Amino acid sequence: NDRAWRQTQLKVAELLIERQPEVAVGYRLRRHAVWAGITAVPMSGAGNKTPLAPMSADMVDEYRAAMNAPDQGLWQRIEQSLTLAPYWFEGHRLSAEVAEKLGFGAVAQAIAEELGTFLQRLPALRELAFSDGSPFLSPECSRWLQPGIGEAGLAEEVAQRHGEQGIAAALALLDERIAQLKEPRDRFHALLVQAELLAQEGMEALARQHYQHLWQEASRLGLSHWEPGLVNRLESLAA
Amino acid sequence: SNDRAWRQTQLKVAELLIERQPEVAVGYRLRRHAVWAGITAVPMSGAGNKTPLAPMSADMVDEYRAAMNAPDQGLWQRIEQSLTLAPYWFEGHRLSAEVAEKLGFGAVAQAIAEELGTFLQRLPALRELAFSDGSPFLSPECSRWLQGLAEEVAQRHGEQGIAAALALLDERIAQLKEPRDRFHALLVQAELLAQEGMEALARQHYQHLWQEASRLGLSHWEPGLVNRLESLAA
Amino acid sequence: LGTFLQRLPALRELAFSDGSPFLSPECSRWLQGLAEEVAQRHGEQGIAAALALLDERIAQLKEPRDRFHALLVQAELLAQEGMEALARQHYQHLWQEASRLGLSHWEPGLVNRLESLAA
């Protein structure tokens, strides 16, 4: 009766979450319960597609709707579903986004550590798709998962002002700083902030585009033979 | 000093062409040429684009704003005669069009607008300047009066705030395969950052844009764009 | 264990009845500005210690930009000591690895000083 034991895990996870919903372990115990019996991916064929239809758009949209005014109640129905919709990897991205907005960084964190785990157990999943052809793992769902001294001296000096006033002022500051810089290295750092800043406001395409021009502008300057760590991240970012 | 009489001449005839027919454009249109043709290049800006020119006495303007609900032909004449002595006071040219739009002179307002639009397109440097007391040449509600990407985006920048625009710019890039498209998209991002008031951040974006064009060899292919980009980085 | 320690910062500092710490400095490792540091080590032990310390630092410094300061350290050290000759020598083989790596197009202060602080 793996079935019954699996109940029990969930039961304990329900309760753990109920008692402490800012604390990972319950979330973790559930993922397990849900992805226990799974030993090898579902039978696929034409275009990697699987005989399993995706999450009811209606349903997904409705969830994406609530996001602006999210509560501890939303988060529960999301989760209820990804307990019944094993492979819905996009919902594990929501759960993480929701949780992060409700104030639970650590749980978001965990939701993902545990997913990345599942994908290393059976990576065939990173390629599979639902009978409608849509991917088990989107590209925005996969960038999610993949992981200076004076650089952070401003970046942290700014992401602070990005919290007191909004993005508008964040940039406003970034500007007034740059006007008083001589060294290109610094000015390149600034522009680098601008990108990171847009990343946190939800500008995945506009941010990435700055990384592209920052990686090449660096590689062009031959920083692979001096300060290659900078260049190596820049490369990872621009994906 | 002889083109003094020539300008006055152009005005008298304007005065007349309107007296005889207040519902017909040309009169008003000539009045413009009397005032803006002598203007060949913009005035010397200083501390925050303040040009050493005084503005329209706010009291004298309040008065015109007062009268706006109950508008007569005598009001309209004083707006216009004022906007004859304060060449760059573009708010007057909105007030004239509003006066004219209520008084049923629908194609005159249109004209009053097209003619400004013309002048601004000629010396676009004016859009950003302002008077000694920092009151804008092209004012807030006046640029709204005269309004595919920088088209659609700076449209969204005025309606919603800046973030909504940046938000859109983002979802446009999402589909812009060819580097030309992308290059423009980042070019907009820059314009928009100057339109929000961070000059040096846009300058820094323009510097890397021209140096990127120059290196792609666009000077022998879209030299217009590369020579615009060049000055914007001064 | 990292979290449990992060939930209560005090548990680290504590010790049992017998004064034996809850968390050893051995266990804390299981979980967890050079000229500033070492230019004072020169006032204490002699110049010979200032170099012995500089050695253990460069043991791990995978970024050559760090190292260039680490050799810029070895330069500063000898310069202040009185050895003005072996000094300028070191500031030449540094100034030229700059013009080589293209540092007039990046961090060009470093350069402009390095030249008049060598010729």
Author numbering:
A (entry chain C): 230 to 376, 383 to 474
B (entry chain A): 229 to 375, 388 to 474
C (entry chain D): 344 to 375, 388 to 474
From the paper:
We also provide the structure of an Nt2-CTD TssA2A construct, demonstrating that 10 subunits assemble into a complex with distinct five-fold symmetry rather than the six-fold symmetry seen in EAEC TssA2B. The structure of crystals of an Ah His6.TssA2A Nt2-CTD construct (R232-K478) was successfully determined to 3.13 Å through molecular replacement using the coordinates of the Ah TssA2A Nt2 dimer as a search model. This identified the position of five dimers of the TssA2A Nt2 domain (R232 to L374, helices α1–α7) in the asymmetric unit, which did not appear to be arranged with any obvious symmetry with respect to each other. The remaining C-terminal residues of each of the 10 subunits (chains A-J) were organised into a separate domain (the CTD) consisting of five α-helices (G388-L472, α8–α12). In the assembled TssA2A CTD decamer two distinct two-fold interfaces can be identified. In the first, a two-fold related interface (shown by PISA32 to be 530 Å2) is formed primarily through interactions between residues from the extended loop linking α11 and α12 and the N-terminal end of α10 and their symmetry-related partners. In the second, more extensive interface (950 Å2), the WEP-mediated dimers assemble around the five-fold axis through interactions between the surface of helices α9, α10 and α11 and their two-fold related symmetry mates to form a mixed interface of hydrophobic/hydrophilic contacts. However, restrictions imposed by the maximum length of the absent linker residues and the relative orientations of the Nt2 and CTD domains allowed the unambiguous assignment of the Nt2 domains to their corresponding CTD (i.e. in the same polypeptide chain). This revealed that in the decameric Ah TssA2A Nt2-CTD complex, the Nt2 domains are not related by the five-fold symmetry exhibited by their corresponding CTDs. Moreover, as a result of the flexible linker, the Nt2 dimers have quite different orientations with respect to the five-fold axis, with angular rotations of up to ~60° about the vertical axis, and ~45° and ~60° about the horizontal and torsional axes, respectively.
